Amino acid sequence: PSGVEGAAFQSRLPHDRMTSQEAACFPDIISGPQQTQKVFLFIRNRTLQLWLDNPKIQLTFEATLQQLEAPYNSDTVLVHRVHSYLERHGLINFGIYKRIKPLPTKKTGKVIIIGSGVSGLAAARQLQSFGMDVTLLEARDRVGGRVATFRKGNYVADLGAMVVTGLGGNPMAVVSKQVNMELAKIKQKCPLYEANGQAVPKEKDEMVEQEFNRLLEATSYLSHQLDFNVLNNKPVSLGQALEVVIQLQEKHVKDEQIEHWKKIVKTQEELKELLNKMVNLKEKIKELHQQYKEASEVKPPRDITAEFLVKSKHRDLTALCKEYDELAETQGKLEEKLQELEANPPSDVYLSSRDRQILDWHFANLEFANATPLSTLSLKHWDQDDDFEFTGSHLTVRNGYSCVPVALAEGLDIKLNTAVRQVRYTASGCEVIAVNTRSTSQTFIYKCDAVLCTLPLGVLKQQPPAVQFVPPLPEWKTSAVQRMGFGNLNKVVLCFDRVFWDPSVNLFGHVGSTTASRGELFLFWNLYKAPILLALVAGEAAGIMENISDDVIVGRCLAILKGIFGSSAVPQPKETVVSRWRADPWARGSYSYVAAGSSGNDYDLMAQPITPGPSIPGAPQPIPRLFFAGEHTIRNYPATVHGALLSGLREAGRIADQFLGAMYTL
Amino acid sequence: RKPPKGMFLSQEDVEAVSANATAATTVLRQLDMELVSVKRQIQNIKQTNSALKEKLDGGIEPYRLPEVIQKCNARWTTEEQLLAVQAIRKYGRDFQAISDVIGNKSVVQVKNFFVNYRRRFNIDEVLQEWEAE
């Protein structure tokens, strides 16, 4: 789409319909006449376009109204109501632009943000935009979070996020216009190689891929048409649904085969009955031929009883010679209908032990998409975010995806090497207690009006706790924490001194020996300028590969490469990096997923803020003091960098509304 | 509303393999065995039919007898008339066989012959006692 309608699309908004958010800020409009709704919708879409066409400069309320058109540019309060809404909630004037109206000298309220991962930085920069006082507490010595970029010499390779999932509707589209980013399209060509080191033939590569998607749709049918969602009191996972589909396909190949032969017995049996009649008729022929040849011995002229007998037996013999030809006609039919059926035997198996290893690579790919084995994924909901897919091709950041957080971080108050150990939230305010990671002796106290927690879901899940909540989080929040899944996914960065692979290929696959090892070093990436190959370790393998030394892991990596390119092309890599996000104390995994037993509603529980009880009993219900953001709190966009960033923008608007008042709801 | 074509999924089947943790394997070895049972049952009737096919070596070509090609005639010689009364006694009402025996008689006027000399040749008594066999 394009126009003012394109701006709505590219801001994840329906262009012709008002959202649940706008109904809440403009209840006068959405309950009013269809005509004012269309007026509001236009000035919404048109300011968005104004922003999206140039997101390197603040879109001031009164630059907006100058470029609006009448009769829309008459109700200056509607414009101001609309413009301020879009600014509060981060649909405009978000990111890194040149401010026109300068920052206020006197700040208002104090926000402590835990984590300067991408959601953390996103909110920090919006809150500081809005006049507040923000400090960020970072346990690491860098502001990346799960966006982590290796750099040595001219090598650059992302250990974290590495793929923009396409610019249609992506807020990262805006960011790349403000931050110098070398975005490069990823060619989806991906040739597989088996364990031997020889390509899969296009016949198999392409025929098993379709089985893969046919199998997926199958499970979907089991879920939505057969209500196969709970078995023996437990919720079904995608992995189990897959196997039940496979076994039912293996079962129906056997049923097919059994009814095919069962036709063959029914006709060898038919034929058996025929031969019996033919053999017993021939013996009746033999006996009559005797009797006629005897009766022909009474030479003529004979009496009529004698002639009768001769004439009689000759007719009888001819008749049974008639029947016997009808029965070798009917033999020929049955004797060919039999050679017909042996000529079309049905499929001998469902999938050969080779196909099943190629399929298992397609399953290892899916275990990469969701960073977890398919026995954990909820069958019903594992793909609930699919309706909000971005348009466009996927991309990589050739200059390293940390160039973005490092950009957002300028001008912000960031305390590195500062690990939070306890969060105290009460009616009168909050104190956050952090230590120095270098010397955990040194202890720090931070008082504030509100805490924004962007701690990874892996950290909130840690047992025993890595961060203490005082008072404890309520059961509705801790139970959402147990129910969600936190996946794992690890990378191996191989740094060579000369390109020895297909350079026009961005990615190629390795097919695994067994089902268990399906995720173990199954995919390679060429994305960056320097000669760098990057290898994935997904599914059940990922966790198991963290207890194995780098040298062994690079050992296996070079084997799989030798087998494909040959033992004399691939040299020793100069630099090698392996990652263990499940071991990292500041991640405890890679990103979240919808576990069997959970649902996308757990992602909205993660985001409801906490309002603590009154200090003086009898005092009135206070303000919310504890807020949450980061990839595990955005229902329609989990497990991504753009979803982290959106979560921080959402929290900045909610926190600002709570502590600065929402001047646009009148 | 309907599975991908080629995929086979039914409630009964699904129930069948979900019941236990080895129901699948069990139900999959319930066909593996039953397919061998049919398979060697084929080779059993195959051998047998091989034997019966072996007993018909040569078919029936030495026992065949030439075709009697004679123009059908009208009148009834006593010799031809006399054969009939035995055909009737040995063939009840199969006018085809009866005409086959005589060789020069209209399938049609065998009935006429039955209708005509029906009293002179006492064809009723004849027939009733072909029936008695």
Coordinates of N, CA and C in Angstrom, one line a residue, chain A residues 247 250-251 254-255 258, chain B residues 17 21-37:
Chain A
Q247 N 2.9 -41.2 12.1 CA 2.5 -42.6 12.3 C 1.2 -42.8 11.5
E250 N 2.2 -43.5 8.1 CA 2.9 -44.8 8.0 C 1.7 -45.8 8.1
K251 N 0.8 -45.6 9.0 CA -0.3 -46.6 9.1 C -1.0 -46.7 7.8
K254 N 0.6 -48.9 5.1 CA 0.4 -50.3 5.3 C -1.0 -50.7 4.9
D255 N -2.0 -50.0 5.3 CA -3.4 -50.3 4.9 C -3.5 -50.4 3.4
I258 N -1.8 -53.6 2.3 CA -2.6 -54.8 2.6 C -3.8 -55.0 1.7
Chain B
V17 N -4.2 -44.4 18.0 CA -2.7 -44.3 18.3 C -2.3 -43.5 19.5
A21 N 1.5 -45.4 25.0 CA 2.7 -44.8 24.4 C 3.3 -45.8 23.4
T22 N 2.7 -47.0 23.3 CA 3.2 -48.0 22.3 C 2.0 -48.4 21.4
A23 N 0.9 -47.8 21.6 CA -0.3 -48.1 20.7 C 0.1 -48.0 19.2
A24 N 0.8 -46.9 18.9 CA 1.3 -46.7 17.5 C 2.1 -48.0 17.1
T25 N 3.2 -48.2 17.8 CA 4.0 -49.4 17.5 C 3.2 -50.7 17.5
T26 N 2.4 -50.9 18.5 CA 1.5 -52.0 18.5 C 0.6 -52.0 17.2
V27 N -0.1 -51.0 17.0 CA -1.0 -51.0 15.8 C -0.2 -51.0 14.5
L28 N 1.0 -50.6 14.6 CA 1.8 -50.7 13.3 C 2.4 -52.1 13.1
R29 N 2.4 -52.9 14.2 CA 2.9 -54.3 14.0 C 1.7 -55.2 13.8
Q30 N 0.5 -54.7 13.8 CA -0.8 -55.4 13.6 C -1.0 -55.5 12.1
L31 N -0.3 -54.8 11.3 CA -0.5 -54.8 9.9 C 0.7 -55.4 9.3
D32 N 1.9 -55.1 9.9 CA 3.1 -55.7 9.5 C 3.0 -57.2 9.5
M33 N 2.5 -57.8 10.7 CA 2.2 -59.2 10.7 C 1.1 -59.5 9.7
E34 N 0.0 -58.9 9.8 CA -1.2 -59.3 8.9 C -0.8 -59.2 7.4
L35 N 0.2 -58.4 7.1 CA 0.6 -58.3 5.7 C 1.5 -59.5 5.3
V36 N 2.1 -60.1 6.3 CA 3.0 -61.2 5.9 C 2.0 -62.4 5.7
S37 N 1.0 -62.5 6.6 CA 0.1 -63.6 6.5 C -0.6 -63.7 5.2

